[PDB]
Design a protein around this ligand. Structure first.
Ligand SMILES: [Mg+2]
Ligand SMILES: [Mg+2]
Ligand SMILES: [Mg+2]
Ligand SMILES: [Mg+2]
Ligand SMILES: [Mg+2]
Ligand SMILES: [Mg+2]
Length: 221
RNA sequence: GCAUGGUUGUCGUCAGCUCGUGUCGUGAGAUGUUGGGUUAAGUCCCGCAACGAGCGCAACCCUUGAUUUUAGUUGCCAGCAU
């Protein structure tokens, strides 16, 4: 939470595309670009560091959502390190609300990645070549890291509520508390523990999400 | 045969018709099944608030077109004598 470390890149978005209810975090606007106040950020990042206290205390599960283009590389590595669960590519509709039917796809993937190793690897001459191996990559590229999620997630960590409208809407309905990095165009009401920060910078996203890794890997020892 | 069972024609071998869970809408409804390519084909790919499934399409069946082993009778006659 070093203010100098945060001072690297935390700008925001243009003036034309700002949410009027983020004005609390706006400080020292510039020519055509808003700049968010770092003083409140370092204060507010503490709660998200300390709200995530309880959720991971009992070996709970957390979900990372990184559909944004400058997010997949970070969230993938943040969750594999901590033994957590992540989403990189498009968020499947009803991943949480219609979570019961997702297991069928998950169990299907587990079955398929068993036959070439444990069962009859060769069951068809070339049918499995064109269809069976083609679907196993199709399933993993969307399911990704949630393939070992035993139950409903305990908390969510998103990076862009404007680009994760499906996720934030279907997590509120299921009453799961979320933490996320919001920009000058996002909405703070939807998020529980707001972290006003830039989302467009690769380093800025990696800086903040790396703190969450150390936060969770502390208790689970 | 306007009380019915069974059987059949026709649109038409046209490529469509629905369902489970989820979501949007006060509601009838909607989505999936739409959008960009491709195909004989909702046949397949990419995207997508949807994820999958069933009956259909395709294949599995018969027949014709090339060829190997088995078998020489009532079939055939290479090489033969009649
Ligand atoms: Mg009649
Ligand atoms: Mg046809
Ligand atoms: Mg419809
Ligand atoms: Mg189409
Ligand atoms: Mg063809
Ligand atoms: Mg079909």
């Amino acid at each position: 939470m070093k203010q100098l470390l945060e001072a690297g890149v935390h700008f925001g978005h243009q003036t034309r595309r700002w949410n009027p209810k983020m004005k609390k975090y706006i400080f020292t606007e510039r020519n055509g670009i808003y700049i968010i106040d770092l003083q409140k950020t370092v204060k507010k990042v503490d709660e998200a560091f300390n709200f995530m206290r309880e959720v991971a205390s009992d070996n709970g599960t957390i979900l990372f959502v990184g559909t944004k283009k400058q997010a997949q590389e970070s969230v993938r590595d943040e969750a594999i390190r901590s033994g957590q669960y992540f989403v990189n590519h498009r968020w499947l509709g009803g991943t949480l609300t219609n979570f019961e039917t997702i297991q069928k796809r998950i169990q299907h993937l587990k079955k398929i990645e068993k036959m070439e190793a444990d069962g009859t690897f060769e069951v068809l001459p070339k049918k499995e070549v064109v269809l069976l191996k083609k679907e196993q990559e199709k399933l993993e590229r969307f399911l990704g890291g949630i393939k070992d999620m035993k139950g409903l997630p305990d908390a969510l960590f998103i990076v862009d509520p404007r680009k994760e409208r499906i996720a934030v809407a279907e997590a509120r309905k299921l009453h799961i508390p979320i933490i996320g990095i919001v920009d000058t165009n996002c909405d703070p009401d939807e998020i529980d523990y707001v972290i006003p920060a830039n989302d467009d910078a690769i380093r800025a996203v990696k800086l903040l999400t790396a703190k969450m890794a150390d936060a969770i890997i502390e208790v689970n020892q």
